[PDB]
Amino acid sequence: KYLVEFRAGKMSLKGTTVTPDKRKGLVYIQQTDDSLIHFCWKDRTSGNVEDDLIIFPDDCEFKRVPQCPSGRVYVLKFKAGSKRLFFWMQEPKTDQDEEHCRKVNEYLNN
Secondary structure, eight states, X not given: OEEEEEXXXXXXXXXXXXXXXXXXXXXXXXXXXXXXXXXXXXXXTTOOXXXXXXXXXXXXXXXXXXXXXXXXXXXXXXXXXXXXXXXXXXXXSSTTHHHHHHHHHHHXXX
């Protein structure tokens, strides 16, 4: 089962433009039986897992992108390299956004 899951959409880079993907999605973290930790994004409608990244401790930090007026954009930032993956919370209430973010960091880095 999942260590962490929450509703969120993803974004993609088209050309040089970061573009929110409109699809309803699920971000989740799962530990597989080889003990590796997978940070995933699943399309809720199709159930297809489109992103599945193996993440080791200290590879990444998940954080709010403050200057987005929604206040619901988060970035998974790879501390080594420029790599960023952007997500946007789709939970109906914002109340748990910061707790979801906190959980991502805990399960990736501890």
